[PDB]
Design a protein around this ligand. Structure first.
Ligand SMILES: CCCCCCCC/C=C/CCCCCCCC(=O)OC[C@H](COP(=O)(O)OCC[N+](C)(C)C)OC(=O)CCCCCCC/C=C/CCCCCCCC
Ligand SMILES: CCCCCCCC/C=C/CCCCCCCC(=O)OC[C@H](COP(=O)(O)OCC[N+](C)(C)C)OC(=O)CCCCCCC/C=C/CCCCCCCC
Ligand SMILES: CCCCCCCC/C=C\CCCCCCCC(=O)OC[C@H](COP(=O)(O)OCC[N+](C)(C)C)OC(=O)CCCCCCC/C=C\CCCCCCCC
Ligand SMILES: CCCCCCCC/C=C\CCCCCCCC(=O)OC[C@H](COP(=O)(O)OCC[N+](C)(C)C)OC(=O)CCCCCCC/C=C\CCCCCCCC
Ligand SMILES: CCCCCCCC/C=C\CCCCCCCC(=O)OC[C@H](COP(=O)(O)OCC[N+](C)(C)C)OC(=O)CCCCCCC/C=C\CCCCCCCC
Ligand SMILES: CCCCCCCC/C=C\CCCCCCCC(=O)O[C@H](COC(=O)CCCCCCC/C=C/CCCCCCCC)COP(=O)(O)OCC[N+](C)(C)C
Ligand SMILES: CC(C)CCC[C@@H](C)[C@H]1CC[C@H]2[C@@H]3CC=C4C[C@@H](O)CC[C@]4(C)[C@H]3CC[C@]12C
Ligand SMILES: CC(C)CCC[C@@H](C)[C@H]1CC[C@H]2[C@@H]3CC=C4C[C@@H](O)CC[C@]4(C)[C@H]3CC[C@]12C
Ligand SMILES: CC(C)CCC[C@@H](C)[C@H]1CC[C@H]2[C@@H]3CC=C4C[C@@H](O)CC[C@]4(C)[C@H]3CC[C@]12C
Ligand code: ALF
Ligand SMILES: [K+]
Ligand SMILES: [K+]
Ligand SMILES: [K+]
Ligand SMILES: [Mg+2]
Lengths: 268, 34, 984
C-alpha cells in the first residue's frame, strides 16, 4: 500500500526523473540520437552499394520462378469465388469495372502504335529497341467490352479472364494452350474463345518491364453458360496448360503452377 | 552454356553439408585437444 | 525460564506425584501417556514432489510461453473452423512451446533446494530403550513410552531419553556437545548450581549421552517439550528464504516480462487498429511473445550453476543446493563456530616451559610446522614424566593411522600428552615396558596431583624415581629444586618469579597448564622390595625436582588463520559465535585472526588504563566479547549497536537460539550472512543463514542435513575458494545474460517493421526458436568457463540493494546498441535476398497484404514478373533462413565482445576452448539447418547461395570494433561517462 513510485518520478531531491536528472537524460538521448544516426547512415550506404551491383533490366536470379503460374481476372472478394446475381446490376458491378480497367490497354485505340508479328513463331529480339506485338481484343469475342459493356453478366454467361504469369526470358515449347473443363458432372458449357487456349508464341519471350515497353500478355477468356430457369450455380471449372512440356502444371505443392481453379455462382 | 531458371541446388547442398561437417569436426578437435 | 531445578527433593515429588524410590504406577503412567502423548518429535508436513514441479511451471517467462501456446492452439482452431483446410504449423508450435515450458520447469526443479531431513537426524538420537523405575522395579521400555514425572536410570553410554531433574548420581558425567558444541564431560549432581538451567548440574537434557557414572532423574519434559525438541522444531520450521541469485533472477525476469508485456499489448492494439483479422493479430502476438522471451536463458543459468558446482566438487566441496554456489561470493558476513570449525576439536600440547624458556610445539593436524628442540636432558625427563604418568592408552587395531588421528581411551589432557609423547620421543607402550609400574595414586578433588612409583632408568637396583603431575600453582609448593639442562638446581626466588611469569603467560593464552616433577630415591633407606601398597603411609611427598610446564589447548586448523585473513581482506566481516567460555573463545579469536593485533576490548582498555570498565567510552574499543547472559536480556537495538560499532566481534557461551538471534541481527542490517558450523546446536543458524556451511569429518548428521554446502575434507580455505568462485560466476552470469538478451532485438524488430511498414515478414517464429534453443545454447554456456579479468578478491562484497545482476546498463547495451546493429545486419541480408530475386526494397513497402494473400498468385516484382503464392513464399522462407544465418554471424562478434567486460580480447586472450568450440558448433548447426535435405518442409529452412553468408560480415566487424573501442574508453578515464552508462 506504499507508493514508492511517487518519489521515483519528479523526485524533489536533485530533480531525478526516473532516476536520471535533466542533464543525464539530455546526454543519453543525444548519444542515442547520434548512435542511431550513424547506424542509419551505415545501413543506407551498404544498401546503396548493394543496389549499385544489381541489373535494372533483368533480376539477378530467376531459379525461384522457373515456370509460370496461372491466374484469373478479376480477383473476387473472397476465396477466388465468383458470386453474383443476374437481376441486380450492383452485384457484378465491381467485376465489370475491373474488367474494363484491365482491358483498356488491349483496345485497338491504345495499341494502334504497336507492331504486328507473325503467328506461331517465337519472337526473340536481340536488339535494343524491343518492340512489342499487339494483342487485338477481337480474339476474346463475347468476352470483350466492344460487343457488350456487360462482360457476359446480366445474361447468365459470365466472362472470366485467364492469363499466364509473366516471366523474363521464358520461351515456351511446343504449342501452349489453356483448356478449361467443368469439374462437376453437370458440366455447364465453358467456352475458351480464341479457339483453344492458343497462347501464341509471338508474345514470348517477355523481356522485362524496363526493356520491353508496351508489352501485352496473351489473354484467355472463359465463358460459363447457365440456363435461364435453372441457375446452374456452384459450378467449379479448372484450367491448366497442356501444350508445353516446358511449362509445368502437375506440381503438388503449388496448386497455381500451370493451373487455376475457380468457382462461379449465379442467382435468379 | 548457362541456362536461367536453373540452379545447382544439389551441389550447393553437398558443399554446405561438407562445410558443416568440417566445421563440426574442427570444433570437436579443438574442444578435445591434448 | 520454566525451571524445575529450584524445587527441593520433596517439592519435586509432590508436584509430579511420583514416589522417591518406587517410581510411577503403571496405570498412572499409561494415563499420562494417553493424556500427554508419546515421547517423540513430530516432523513437519512435507510438500509432495509433484507440487514443487507445478509451482516451478508458473514462472514469469513460463506464463508468457503458456499464453503463447494457448494462442497457437486458438489460432489453429480458428484456422480450421474458417477454412476447413488447416496447416499443422500452429498446432506444432503450441506443442513445442508447451514442451519448452516443461523442460524449463525441469531445469528450475533441478536448480532448487532439496528440502532437509533434520527431523530424521534428530530422531536418530532418540534411544531405542529407556530404563524407567515403575512399581519399584527396573523395567526396560521404549523411550517413546516415557511419560512426564517418572524415575529414569542412565549409566555408561546411554542416551538421555527426556529432560531429567537429577535427584541422585554416582560420579555421573554427561556429554553436552548437543547444547554447547563442547565434548568435555560435565559433572551431574542433584544439588542446585546455576540459575540458568543450561549450566545447572541437576538437569540432564535429551539428545545427550552419559559418558560415565549412573544417575536417577525425574522427567520434566517429553518429546517436543524438551530443550532439544524445541530446537529441532525451530530448525525444521525455519527456511533460508530467497537466495541472492534467486532474487537477481526474479528481478531480471520481472524486467524482461514487463518489456514483453508492454510491447505485446501495444502492438496488439496497433494490429487491431490497423484492421488485422483475428488470426493475423494472434499470429503477430505469438511472434512478438516468442521473440521477447529468452527461451533458453534460465536453463543456461542452471547449466552454468551446475558447472561451477561441479568445479568445486573437485575441491572436496559438496554443494547440496545449486543456488549456494553464488551466495558465498555474495557473502559480506561470516558467523563461524569455534569448536570443530575453526579449531580441530582435539586437545593438543601447544606450549611448554623448561630451561626457563617457553617452547612452542607444532599443533597442526598434518604436522607440517617446525618443532622445538629435543636435545635436552631435562626435556627427556619431562617427556618421560608426561608420557609415563598417563593412564590413557591407545586403542587396538588402529596402528595404520596418523598418530594425531587415533582414538585414545582416556581424558582429553591425558590423550594430548600421550599423542605429544608419541610425536616427540619413541612409544609410550615401550617406555612403560621399560619402567614397570609398582604403585599409583589416582587424581582426587582435594589432592590436585597424581604421583606414581616405578623402576629407575639407571639400572641400579636401589634407585627409583617418583613421577608427579598436577596443578602448576600447587606443584611448586611440593618442589624444592628445578632441573636445568639435566642439572639439579635448588629453588630460587628469582626462579619462582620466572615460573609465575611463565604460568601467567601460558594461562593468558587460553591454555590449561600442568606441572611435572620427579624425585629420585636418596639412598638405601627405602629398599626396592618395600611395599608401597600400604595406604595412608607416613611418607610425606616433598622436596621434589620440578622439570617443566605443559599447556594444552584446542588448536586452530592449519588453514584457518590464513583463510580468515584472506576473507577479511576480501571485505568479509568474520564474527565468532561459540558455545564455549569467553576466555578460550577470545584466545582462539586472537590466534586465528578474528581479533587482530592492536585491537582491544573495553575490558582490556580499562585494565590497561587502570580504571573500571564503566568510566571508559565503549567507542574506543573496536573489539568486543559478548557473553550469552548479556545477550539474553539485550534488546534488538542494543544488539544492532554491537554489530555496527565493532569490527571484531566474538560471541561466547551462546545457546542454539542465541546463534539464531545473532544471525537474524546480522541479516537485519542488509547483509548476506554465511554460517559455518559442525554441531547440532548450529543447525538453526545454518538453516536461517543465507548459506550454511558444514564440516565433513567433524560435522554431525544434523549439521550437514541443515547446510547448503559441505566441506568434505574439512579444509577451511575452501571458503575462500567458494567466495572467489561465487564472484566469478556472478560476473560470468552477467556476460551470459547479456549475450542471450542482445539477440532478442534481431528477433523483435522484424515483427515491428512488419506491422509498421507492411513489408513481407523477415523472420518466422520457428526461426526464433531455432536461434534460442539452438545456436545460442553452447555459446552462452561457454561464458561460464571465463577467468577473472582482475583480482576479484580485492573488491568489496557487492551491495544486494544496489549491485544488481541485470541493471539498466546491461539493458542499455544489449537492447540499444549491439542488438540494434545485429537487427540492421539481418535486415540488410533480408533486403539483399529479396532484391536479388526481383523485389527491390522500395517495392516491398506495403506489399504485405498481397504477399500473404493465398489467392493472389500474380504478385508483380520490380521487373514485371508475376509470382504465385508458393514461389514468393519460398523466397520469403529463404529470407528467413538468411536472417537466421546473419544473426549467427553477428553473434560471433557478440560472443567475442561479451567474453570480457573491461579488458580487451587482445589482453585477455582466446584460451577459452569451450567458446571457440561454441562458435564452430553454432556455425556448423546453422549450415546443417540451412543445407540438410528435408528441412524446407520441417522447419522451412532453405539453402542459401554462398555469397549470402557474407551479408552480415560488415555489422559483425562493426560490433567488434565498437565494443573494443568502448572498453578502451572505459579503461582510460575510469570514472567517465562511458563507464557510468555502458559498464554493466
Ligand atoms: C525492438 C524494440 C526494443 C525496445 C526495448 C525497450 C527497452 C525498455 C526497457 C526499459 C527498462 C529500463 C530499466 C532496466 C532496469 C530496471 C531495474 C533497475 O535496475 O533500474 C534502476 C533504476 C533506479 O534508478 P536509481 O533511482 O537507483 O538511480 C540512481 C542514479 N543512477 C542511475 C546513476 C544510478 O531504475 C530505472 O532507471 C528505470 C528507468 C526506466 C526508463 C524507461 C523509459 C525510457 C524512456 C525514455 C524516453 C524519455 C522519457 C522521459 C523524458 C524526460 C525528459 C526530461
Ligand atoms: C502478452 C500480451 C498479452 C496481450 C493480451 C492478449 C489477449 C489475447 C486474447 C485473444 C482473444 C481474442 C478474442 C477471441 C477471438 C476473437 C473472437 C471471435 O469472434 O472468434 C470467432 C472465431 C474466429 O472467427 P473470426 O472472427 O476469425 O472469423 C472472421 C472471418 N475471417 C477471419 C475469415 C475474415 O470463430 C471460429 O472460427 C472458431 C470457433 C471456436 C472454435 C475454438 C474454440 C475457442 C477455444 C479456444 C481455446 C483453445 C485452448 C486449447 C488449449 C489446449 C491445452 C492442451
Ligand atoms: C559505431 C557507433 C558509432 C557512434 C558513435 C556516436 C558517439 C556519440 C558521441 C556524442 C554523444 C555522446 C555524448 O554526448 O557523450 C558525452 C560525454 C561527456 O559527458 P559529460 O561531460 O556530460 O559528463 C559529465 C561528468 N560530470 C558528471 C563529472 C560532470 O563524452 C564522453 O564521456 C567521452 C566520449 C564519449 C563518447 C560517447 C561514447 C563513445 C563510446 C563508444 C563509441 C566509440 C566509437 C566506436 C566507433 C566504431 C566505428 C567502427
Ligand atoms: C539504428 C536504427 C536505424 C534504422 C533506420 C533505418 C533507415 C534506413 C533507410 C535506408 C533507405 C535506403 C537508403 C539507400 O541506400 O537508398 C539508395 C537508393 C539509390 O539507389 O535510394 C532508394 O532507392 C531509396 C528507396 C527507398 C528505400 C526504402 C526501403 C527501406 C525502408 C525501410 C526498411 C527499414 C529496415 C530497417 C528497420 C530498422 C531495423 C532495426
Ligand atoms: C537448432 C534448433 C533446435 C530447435 C528445435 C525446435 C524446433 C522449433 C520449431 C518447432 C515447431 C515448428 C514445427 O513444425 O516443427 C515440426 C518438426 C518436425 O516437422 P514435421 O515432420 O512434423 O513436419 C510435418 C510436415 N507436414 C507439415 C507436411 C505435415 O519438429 C522437430 O523438428 C523436432 C521433432 C519433434 C519434437 C517435439 C518435442 C520437442 C520440441 C521442443 C522441445 C525443445 C527442447 C528445448 C526446450 C528448452 C530447453 C532450454
Ligand atoms: C568480419 C568477419 C567477422 C568478424 C568477427 C569479429 C570477432 C572476431 C574478431 C577478432 C577476434 C580476434 C581474437 C584474437 C585473440 C588473440 C589475442 C591474443 O593475442 O592472445 C594471445 C593468446 O591467444 C591464444 O593463444 C588463442 C588464440 C585463438 C585464436 C582463435 C582463432 C579463431 C577465432 C575465430 C573467431 C572469429 C569468428 C569466427 C566464428 C567461427 C567461424 C567458423 C596472446 O596471449 P598470451 O598467451 O601472450 O598471454 C597469456 C598470459 N596472460 C593472458 C596472463 C597475459
Ligand atoms: C564497413 C562498411 C563501410 C561496409 C564496407 C563493406 C561493404 C562495402 C561490403 C562488405 C560485404 C559486401 C556485400 C556482401 C554480399 C553481397 C551480396 C552480393 O549481391 C554482392 C553484393 C553484396 C551486397 C556485397 C556489397 C558490398 C559489401 C556490403
Ligand atoms: C529501431 C530503433 C529506432 C528502436 C529504438 C529503441 C530505443 C528508443 C529504446 C530501446 C532501448 C532503450 C534504452 C534502454 C535503457 C536505457 C537506460 C535508462 O537508464 C535510460 C533509458 C535507456 C537509455 C533507454 C532509452 C530508449 C531505448 C534506447
Ligand atoms: C572470417 C572468419 C572470422 C570466419 C569465416 C567463416 C567462413 C570461413 C565459413 C563460415 C560458413 C561457411 C560457409 C557455409 C556454407 C557454404 C555454402 C557452400 O555451398 C559454399 C561454402 C560456404 C559459403 C561456406 C564458406 C565458408 C564459410 C563462410
Ligand atoms: F562447536 Al560450538 F559453539 F564451538 F557449537
Ligand atoms: K527470443
Ligand atoms: K540456509
Ligand atoms: K535470444
Ligand atoms: Mg562444534
Amino acid at each position: 500500500s506504499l507508493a514508492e513510485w511517487k518519489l521515483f518520478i519528479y523526485n524533489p531531491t536533485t530533480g531525478e526523473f526516473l532516476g536520471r536528472t535533466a542533464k543525464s537524460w539530455g546526454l543519453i538521448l543525444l548519444f542515442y540520437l547520434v548512435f542511431y544516426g550513424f547506424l542509419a547512415a551505415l545501413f543506407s550506404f551498404t544498401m546503396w552499394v548493394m543496389l549499385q551491383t544489381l541489373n535494372d533490366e533483368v533480376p539477378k536470379y530467376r531459379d525461384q520462378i522457373p515456370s509460370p503460374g496461372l491466374m484469373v481476372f478479376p480477383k473476387p472478394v473472397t476465396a477466388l469465388e465468383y458470386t453474383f446475381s443476374r437481376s441486380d446490376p450492383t452485384s457484378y458491378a465491381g467485376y465489370i469495372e475491373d474488367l474494363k480497367k484491365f482491358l483498356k490497354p488491349y483496345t485497338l485505340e491504345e495499341q494502334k502504335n504497336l507492331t504486328v508479328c507473325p503467328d506461331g513463331a517465337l519472337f526473340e529480339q536481340k536488339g535494343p529497341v524491343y518492340v512489342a506485338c499487339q494483342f487485338p481484343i477481337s480474339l476474346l469475342q463475347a468476352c470483350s467490352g466492344m460487343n457488350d459493356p456487360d462482360f457476359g453478366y446480366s445474361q447468365g454467361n459470365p466472362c472470366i479472364l485467364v492469363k499466364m504469369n509473366r516471366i523474363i526470358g521464358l520461351k515456351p515449347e511446343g504449342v501452349p494452350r489453356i483448356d478449361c473443363v467443368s469439374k462437376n458432372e453437370d458440366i455447364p458449357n465453358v467456352a475458351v474463345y480464341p479457339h483453344n487456349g492458343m497462347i501464341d508464341l509471338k508474345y514470348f519471350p517477355y523481356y522485362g518491364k524496363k526493356l520491353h515497353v508496351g508489352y501485352l500478355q496473351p489473354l484467355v477468356a472463359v465463358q460459363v453458360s447457365f440456363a435461364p430457369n435453372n441457375t446452374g450455380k456452384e459450378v467449379t471449372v479448372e484450367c491448366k496448360i497442356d501444350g508445353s512440356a516446358n511449362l509445368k502444371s502437375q506440381d503438388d505443392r503449388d496448386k497455381f503452377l500451370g493451373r487455376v481453379m475457380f468457382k462461379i455462382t449465379a442467382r435468379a | 552454356e548457362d541456362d536461367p531458371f536453373f540452379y545447382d541446388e544439389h551441389t550447393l547442398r553437398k558443399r554446405g553439408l561438407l562445410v558443416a561437417a568440417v566445421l563440426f569436426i574442427t570444433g570437436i578437435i579443438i574442444l578435445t585437444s591434448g | 525460564s520454566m525451571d524445575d531445578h529450584k524445587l527441593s527433593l520433596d517439592e519435586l515429588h509432590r508436584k509430579y506425584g511420583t514416589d522417591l524410590s518406587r517410581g510411577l504406577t503403571s496405570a498412572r503412567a499409561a494415563e499420562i501417556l494417553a493424556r500427554d502423548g508419546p515421547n517423540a518429535l513430530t516432523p513437519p508436513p512435507t510438500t509432495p514432489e509433484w507440487i514443487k514441479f507445478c509451482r516451478q511451471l508458473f514462472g514469469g517467462f513460463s506464463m508468457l510461453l503458456w499464453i503463447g501456446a494457448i494462442l497457437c492452439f486458438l489460432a489453429y482452431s480458428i484456422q480450421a473452423a474458417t477454412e476447413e483446410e488447416p496447416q499443422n504449423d500452429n498446432l506444432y508450435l503450441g506443442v513445442v512451446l508447451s514442451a519448452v515450458v516443461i523442460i524449463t520447469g525441469c531445469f528450475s526443479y533441478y536448480q532448487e533446494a532439496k528440502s532437509s531431513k533434520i527431523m530424521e537426524s534428530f530422531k536418530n538420537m532418540v534411544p531405542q530403550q529407556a530404563l524407567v523405575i515403575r512399581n519399584g522395579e527396573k523395567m526396560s521400555i521404549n523411550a517413546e513410552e516415557v511419560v512426564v514425572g517418572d524415575l529414569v536410570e542412565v549409566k555408561g553410554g546411554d542416551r538421555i531419553p527426556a529432560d531429567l531433574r537429577i535427584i541422585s548420581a554416582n560420579g555421573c558425567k554427561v556429554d553436552n556437545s548437543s547444547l554447547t558444541g563442547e565434548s568435555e564431560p560435565q559433572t551431574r549432581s542433584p544439588d542446585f548450581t546455576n540459575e540458568n538451567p543450561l549450566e545447572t548440574r541437576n538437569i540432564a537434557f535429551f539428545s545427550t549421552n552419559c559418558v560415565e557414572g549412573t544417575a536417577r532423574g525425574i522427567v520434566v519434559y517429553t518429546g517436543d517439550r524438551t530443550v532439544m525438541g524445541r530446537i529441532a522444531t525451530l530448525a525444521s520450521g525455519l527456511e533460508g528464504g530467497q537466495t541472492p541469485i534467486a532474487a537477481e533472477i526474479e528481478h531480471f525476469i520481472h524486467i524482461i516480462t514487463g518489456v514483453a508485456v508492454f510491447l505485446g499489448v501495444s502492438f496488439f492494439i496497433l494490429s487491431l487498429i490497423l484492421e488485422y483479422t483475428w488470426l493475423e493479430a494472434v499470429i503477430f502476438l505469438i511472434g512478438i511473445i516468442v521473440a521477447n522471451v529468452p527461451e533458453g536463458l534460465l536453463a543456461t543459468v542452471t547449466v552454468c550453476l551446475t558447472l561451477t558446482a561441479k568445479r568445486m566438487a573437485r575441491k572436496n566441496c559438496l554443494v547440496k543446493n545449486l543456488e549456494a554456489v553464488e551466495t558465498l561470493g555474495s557473502t559480506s558476513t561470516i558467523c563461524s563456530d569455534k569448536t570443530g570449525t575453526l579449531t580441530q576439536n582435539r586437545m593438543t600440547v601447544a606450549h611448554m616451559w623448561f630451561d626457563n624458556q617457553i617452547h612452542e610445539a607444532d599443533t597442526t593436524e598434518n604436522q607440517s610446522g617446525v618443532s622445538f628442540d629435543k636435545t635436552s636432558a631435562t626435556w627427556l625427563a619431562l617427556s618421560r614424566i608426561a608420557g609415563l604418568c598417563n593412564r590413557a592408552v591407545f586403542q587396538a587395531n588402529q596402528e595404520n593411522l596418523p598418530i594425531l588421528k587415533r582414538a585414545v581411551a582416556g581424558d582429553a589432557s591425558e590423550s594430548a600428552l600421550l599423542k605429544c609423547i608419541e610425536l616427540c620421543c619413541g612409544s609410550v607402550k615401550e617406555m612403560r615396558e621399560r619402567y614397570a609400574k609398582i604403585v599409583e595414586i589416582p587424581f582426587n578433588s582435594t589432592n590436585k596431583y597424581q604421583l606414581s612409583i616405578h623402576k629407575n632408568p639407571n639400572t641400579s637396583e636401589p634407585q627409583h624415581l617418583l613421577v608427579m603431575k598436577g596443578a602448576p600453582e600447587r606443584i611448586l609448593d611440593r618442589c624444592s629444586s628445578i632441573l636445568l639442562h639435566g642439572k639439579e638446581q635448588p629453588l630460587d626466588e628469582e626462579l619462582k618469579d620466572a615460573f609465575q611469569n611463565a604460568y601467567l603467560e601460558l594461562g593468558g593464552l587460553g591454555e590449561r597448564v600442568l606441572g611435572f616433577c620427579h624425585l629420585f630415591l636418596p639412598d638405601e633407606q627405602f629398599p626396592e622390595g618395600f611395599q608401597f601398597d600400604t595406604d595412608d603411609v607416613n611418607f610425606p611427598i616433598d622436596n621434589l625436582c620440578f622439570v617443566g610446564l605443559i599447556s594444552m589447548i584446542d588448536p586452530p586448523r592449519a588453514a584457518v588463520p590464513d583463510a580468515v585473513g584472506k576473507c577479511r581482506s576480501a571485505g568479509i566481516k568474520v564474527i565468532m559465535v561459540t558455545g564455549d567460555h569467553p576466555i578460550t573463545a577470545k584466545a582462539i579469536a586472537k590466534g586465528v585472526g578474528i581479533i587482530s593485533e592492536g585491537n582491544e576490548t573495553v575490558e582490556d582498555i580499562a585494565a590497561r588504563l587502570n580504571i573500571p570498565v564503566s568510566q571508559v567510552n565503549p567507542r574506543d574499543a573496536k573489539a568486543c566479547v559478548v557473553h550469552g547472559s548479556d545477550l539474553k536480556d539485550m534488546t534488538s537495538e542494543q544488539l544492532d549497536d554491537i554489530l555496527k560499532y565493532h569490527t571484531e566481534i566474538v560471541f561466547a557461551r551462546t545457546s542454539p537460539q542465541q546463534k539464531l538471534i545473532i544471525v537474524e541481527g546480522c541479516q537485519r542490517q542488509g547483509a548476506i550472512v554465511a554460517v559455518t558450523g559442525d554441531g547440532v546446536n548450529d543447525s538453526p543458524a545454518l538453516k536461517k543463514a543465507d548459506i550454511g556451511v558444514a564440516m565433513g569429518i567433524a560435522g554431525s548428521d544434523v549439521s550437514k542435513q541443515a547446510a547448503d554446502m559441505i566441506l568434505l575434507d574439512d579444509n577451511f580455505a575452501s571458503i575462500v575458494t567458494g567466495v572467489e568462485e561465487g564472484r566469478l560466476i556472478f560476473d560470468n552470469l552477467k556476460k551470459s545474460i547479456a549475450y542471450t538478451l542482445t539477440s532478442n532485438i534481431p528477433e523483435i524488430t522484424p515483427f515491428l517493421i512488419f506491422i509498421i511498414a507492411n513489408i513481407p515478414l523477415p523472420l518466422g517464429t520457428v526461426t526464433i526458436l531455432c536461434i534460442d534453443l539452438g545456436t545460442d545454447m553452447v555459446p552462452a554456456i561457454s561464458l561460464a568457463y571465463e577467468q577473472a579479468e582482475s583480482d576479484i578478491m580485492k573488491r568489496q562484497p557487492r551491495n544486494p540493494k544496489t549491485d544488481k545482476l541485470v541493471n539498466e546498463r546491461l539493458i542499455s547495451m544489449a537492447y540499444g546498441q549491439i542488438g540494434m546493429i545485429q537487427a540492421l545486419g539481418g535486415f540488410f541480408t533480408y533486403f539483399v535476398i529479396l532484391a536479388e530475386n526481383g523485389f527491390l526494397p522500395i517495392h516491398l513497402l506495403g506489399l504485405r497484404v498481397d504477399w500473404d494473400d493465398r489467392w493472389i498468385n500474380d504478385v508483380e516484382d520490380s521487373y514485371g514478373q508475376q509470382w504465385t503464392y508458393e514461389q514468393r513464399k519460398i523466397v520469403e522462407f529463404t529470407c528467413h533462413t538468411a536472417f537466421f544465418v546473419s544473426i549467427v554471424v553477428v553473434q560471433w562478434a557478440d560472443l567475442v565482445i561479451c567474453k570480457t567486460r573491461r579488458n580487451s580480447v587482445f589482453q585477455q586472450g582466446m584460451k577459452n576452448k569451450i567458446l571457440i568450440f561454441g562458435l564452430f558448433e553454432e556455425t556448423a548447426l546453422a549450415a546443417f539447418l540451412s543445407y540438410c535435405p528435408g528441412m524446407g518442409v520441417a522447419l522451412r529452412m532453405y539453402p542459401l547461395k554462398p555469397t549470402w553468408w557474407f551479408c552480415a560480415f560488415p555489422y559483425s566487424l562493426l560490433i567488434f570494433v565498437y565494443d573494443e573501442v568502448r572498453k578502451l574508453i572505459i579503461r582510460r578515464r575510469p570514472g567517465g561517462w562511458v563507464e557510468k552508462e555502458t559498464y554493466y
